[PDB]
Structures are given as structure tokens and as C-alpha cells.
């Protein structure tokens, strides 16, 4: 049976073939391939439980498919229409929607970005490349950030197209102000780890019931 | 500390619930099974699941069902549970599912609602009773499928309901699962076909043109 591992078994004896080794923090020494050390604690370990980082590809095959160059100057190519899933007419599926006070969001990336997901979404639902897992600030291992909506605001809301050898099909929220702006104007607050450690903190007390 | 009921619900968490059957929490099948899955991937999909949110059982049924009494039935969201935009219209479109895509579902094959394989239970906005085992061959009412021929579904984000945040994606098929299988559009997957991490990745979507 298939055992889980960093590389597909086919990639040995030299899975890093064609990859310029730069820094041993990263897989094959290449920051585009994400960090060697993966999270061992909740919720990150839950979010990465289904993550085969290269799918069935080897590292250079993965870069050749999803980036402009296997060499270090290659950059990842991103999907059209901001990565929203496309309908049968090749039009993105989304709508402007209001996020309610209390809603918890998370993100792999700096606070200059504009793309978030609902708290706890699996990594493979986000169609993100391996390098979004790289640590840039020691206060935020894996560049993972969690926020809670403190004042209602409108975002582009819709399903995530598959990309980077993953199925996608989470939901993404594309904001019209970066995360820093939303924090400064009182739309989001940062949650620390103790505010998303318990199961009940993932449930929804803010949506009212019918009648 | 995680637990079945919130701490405030003791010493009588099942107050107001008529006990019917000890397979279910408080003996009520509407509140889901006592024994939760211990195997991958159901355990991964339920790791963030607080079954009642911060509510007690009777409060939960009072909010989401017509009656706390056993004749009460769950009330479901408008517009087939799609997230609504700022004009209260559901967000969705018709989309073609590609050959190789894996889907899963809690429910019988007379149903039409599916999600991407491995979506967390709280992303599905499903009540606790969708975890109830109805056929012993399918514990927890859980089914996995793989697209064997392209077909068009309604596709869109899931609105919050049932004290959960939603915001997974749902696929609403125009033919029930039985007819999709009979016509060669879906195939049933054994648990051995979704046991390894690589079986959750995507070999079917082509890369960008360069
Ligand atoms: C507590 O509730 C469970 C579940 O019952 C269902 O849900 C409740 C809420 C009510 O709506 C019921 O009407 C529902 O049926 C009961 O479990 C059932 O118990 C009966 C009696 O022991 C079982 O009947 C047996 O079934 C055998 C075959 O079972 C297998 O195949 C069937 C399909 O053919 C499948 O459904 C089942 O899961 C097995 O895989 C059969 O050989 C035998 O002769 C007899 O008919 C029935 O199978 C049970 N259902 C389930 C889903 O386990 C409990 O009995 C009930 N307890 C009490 C104390 O009331
Ligand atoms: C990654 O980098 C390589 C190497 O190029 C060098 O580094 C770049 C960052 C730039 O600073 C380049 O100026 C620098 O040379 C790129 O390869 C280069 O691509 C160009 C265009 O495809 C090639 O142009 C060629 O011209 C030569 C003659 O000089 C012809 O033989 C070719 O047929 C073609 O016309 C150039 O040869 C090539 N260099 C090498 C060593 O292969 C690469 O394009 C770049 N990748 C990306 C995505 O930018
Ligand atoms: C590999 O990359 C990391 C990250 O860029 C480098 O770590 C930095 O190290 C310096 C000290 O040398 C610190 O001041 C920085 O804060 C670190 N950045 C981090 C942790 O993100 C590391 O030095 C690099 N190693 C090699 C051999 O190039
Ligand atoms: C969503 O709305 C956009 C414009 O909205 C206006 O400007 C933004 C920045 C917010 O301030 C919003 O509250 C304002 O009403 C449109 O450009 C865009 O096309 C809309 N998208 C869809 C899918 O309708
Ligand atoms: C999606 O398309 C619907 C009609 O599609 C046709 O009929 C259904 C029953 C399926 O067999 C489908 O494959 C066919 O192409 C419309 O009724 C519906 O409004 C459409 N939804 C949109 C455009 O959002
Ligand atoms: C449940 O039964 C009680 C008693 O018969 C009744 O008063 C109540 O209206 C019923 N609820 C529903 C939703 O029918």
C-alpha cells in the first residue's frame, strides 16, 4: 500500500534532480517547495493531514507544470479570475457578500494580502503552492494567521478552483482592503493561538436561527 | 478541554430531551451518535466539530428545529443552503466536474448534495443526525465517489447553519447519486482508495499554458 512521505517513491534516488539547492530550511533547498519541517500541533496539523505537497509529481516536474522555470528565477503561475472556480461559460463563480461580526477567518501569507479562507479549511482546499507554508516571522510559524470579524464588511466570496496539483473547492474571501487596513479600521482583530485551540471556538454563535 | 456538551449544561445536559435510543446523544437521534469515528479520514473531518456549538441540547433544538419535543424536525436554510450575496441571492453557478475528481457525502444515494472529498464537517452546515449510521455497510452515512465521466452540477459556497460556520463548497446534482452511478458518471470508492495523502491530491487538472 501507499505510505505517506515527502516525495513520491518514484522520485528516488535523486528526487531533487534539476533543483538548485539554496537553503536547507526548504525542501530540496528551494523555498518555492516549502519548508522541510511541517506543523505538529492543532489546527495546522489537522489542516495539512491530507496534503501531498507535490501530488504524484517529483519536484522539478511540479515546478515545470506550475511555474515559469525550474531554475531559481522561475515563479509560480496563478489561475485566472483570481482563482475562483469557473462555470460552464468560463465565468468565475462568486458574489459580493457581507461577512458577519464573529466570523473567524485564516490565511497563509502576509497582512499585505487580500485572500482569506474560513478558519480551519484544509490546505488542499485553498489551492496554494508549497511556499505559502514558509515562515517569514517567528511570531507566526508557517505564516499562518487567524482573524475574527469585528465589524461587517463586504468581500468577494466564492469557490476555489483547483490548482498547484490540489483539488481546491474551499471557499475564498477576496477583500477590497488588505488585512492591515481591515485591522486598522476595526473590521478584523487578530486571534492568538489560545483563541482557536478548542473545538467550540470553531463553531458558529453569530448566525441567528430561522422562524 | 473538549467534550460532548459545554460545561454550563451540567449537571443535567439532556434537560427537556426525551430519551429514545442510547445510540444517540441524550437518546435523541436528532443529536447524532454517541460514538464518533476513530479512523481517518472521518476523524480528521470531525476534529473541529463542536456538535452543539456553545449551546445546550434543548437550546440547540429550540434554535434549529420546530420543537424540542421528539416531533420537532430540523429547519433548513433557504436557497438550498447556498451562501447569499448582499442582495440575498444565492452564490453558485453551473460547473462541469472533471473526470478524476473525488466527492463525498453524508446521506443515502437518493440524495443530490455532495462536497469535495475530505471537507470538514463544520464546512457542510449539516445537523448532527447526518452522522447517524443507517446502513452498517456505510458507517456514519458516509460515501465517497470519483467522477468517471464529465457532468454539470450546481456549484457554490455553503451558508452557515446548524451552529456551524459553513463555507465549504457544495455540489447539487441534477440526477440523484443512484442515477449518476447507473449512467457511468460516478463510481463508488473503497476506503482503501482514500487512505493515503496522495489520493487527496489532483492529477487531473492541467497546468497553465506556457
Ligand atoms: C436504536 O436505533 C437504531 C437505528 O434504527 C434506525 O434509526 C432509528 C432512529 C429509527 O428511525 C429506526 O426505525 C431506524 O431503523 C436501531 O437499530 C436497528 O435495530 C434493528 C433491530 O435490532 C436492526 O434490524 C435488524 O437488521 C438486520 C440487518 O441489519 C443490516 O442490514 C440493514 C439493511 O438490510 C442495515 O440497515 C443495518 O444497519 C445492518 O447493516 C437484520 O438481519 C435483522 O433481522 C433485523 O431486521 C436494524 O438493522 C438496526 N439499524 C441500524 C441502522 O443499526 C436500534 O434497534 C434502536 N434501539 C432501540 C433500543 O430501539
Ligand atoms: C531564467 O534565467 C535564464 C538565464 O538567463 C539569465 O538570467 C535571467 C534572469 C536574465 O538575467 C537573462 O538575461 C540572463 O541571461 C533564462 O534563460 C534565457 O532565456 C532567454 C530567453 O528565452 C534566452 O535567449 C536566447 O538568446 C540566445 C543567444 O544568446 C539563443 O541561443 C536562444 O535561442 C534564445 O534566443 C537565453 O539563452 C536563456 N539563457 C539560458 C542560459 O538558457 C530564462 O529565460 C529565465 N526564466 C524566466 C522565467 O525568466
Ligand atoms: C535560509 O533562509 C532563512 C530565512 O530567510 C535564513 O534565516 C535568517 O537568518 C538570519 C540570521 O542569519 C536571521 O536574522 C533572520 O531572521 C532569518 N530569517 C528567517 C528565520 O526567516 C537563513 O540564514 C538562511 N540560511 C542560509 C544558509 O542561507
Ligand atoms: C462588488 O462590488 C464592487 C464595487 O463595490 C463598491 O466598491 C467596493 C470597493 C465596496 O466599497 C462596496 O461596498 C461598494 O459597493 C464591484 O466593482 C464588483 O463588480 C462587485 N462584484 C460583483 C460580483 O458583483
Ligand atoms: C443551470 O442549468 C439549468 C439547465 O441545465 C440543463 O438542464 C439541467 C436539468 C441539467 O441537465 C443541465 O446539465 C442542462 O444543461 C438551468 O435551469 C439553471 O438555471 C442553470 N443555473 C445557473 C445558470 O445558475
Ligand atoms: C408536537 O406535539 C405537541 C403535542 O401534540 C404539539 O402541541 C406541537 O404543536 C407539535 N409540534 C409540531 C412541530 O407539530
Numbering used by the authors:
A (entry chain A): 23 to 233
B (entry chain B): 25 to 234
Give the original sentences from the paper that presented this experimental model:
The majority of cellular NAD+ is generated in the salvage pathway, where the Nam released in signaling reactions is resynthesized into NAD+.4 Given its importance, NAD+ is targeted by toxins from many pathogenic microorganisms, including Streptococcus pyogenes and Mycobacterium tuberculosis. These toxins invade cells and act as NAD glycohydrolases, cleaving NAD+ into Nam and ADPR and rapidly depleting the cellular NAD pool, ultimately leading to cell death. In this context, we recently discovered a new fungal NADase on the surface of conidia from Aspergillus fumigatus (AfNADase), the predominant etiologic agent of Aspergillosis. The catalytic part of the TNT is structurally highly similar to AfNADase. Intriguingly, the active site architecture of the bacterial and fungal enzymes is conserved, but their structural superimposition reveals the presence of a unique C-terminal calcium-binding motif in AfNADase, which is located at the edge of the dimerization interface. In the present study, we addressed the structural and functional role of calcium binding by introducing mutations in the C-terminus of AfNADase that precluded the binding of the metal ion.
In the first variant, we abolished calcium binding by mutating two critical residues for metal ion coordination into alanine (D219A/E220A), referred to here as AfNADaseD219A/E220A. Interestingly, the KM (88.3 ± 12.2 μM) and Vmax (2956 ± 157 μmol/min/mg) of AfNADaseD219A/E220A were far less affected than the AfNADase NcC-Term. The ASU contained two homodimers, which were lacking Ca2+ ions as expected. A closer inspection revealed that one dimer represented the native-like conformation, whereas the other had a conformation with an unfolded C-terminus. Superimposition of the dimers to AfNADase (C alpha) showed RMSD of 0.25 and 1.00 for chain AB (native-like) and chain CD (unfolded C-terminus), respectively. Dimer 1 has a C-terminus folded in a manner identical to that of AfNADase with the characteristic helix-turn-helix motif for the Ca2+-binding site, allowing the C-terminus to intertwine on the surface of the complementary protomer participating in dimer formation. The two α-helixes, forming part of the dimerization interface of AfNADase8 and dimer 1 of AfNADaseD219A/E220A, are unfolded in dimer 2 and rather form a loop-to-loop interaction. In dimer 2, the entire catalytic domain translocates ca. 2 Å away from the dimerization interface, also showing major rearrangements in the loop (156NTFDGMYPY164) containing residues Phe158 and Tyr164 8 that were earlier observed to be important for substrate binding.
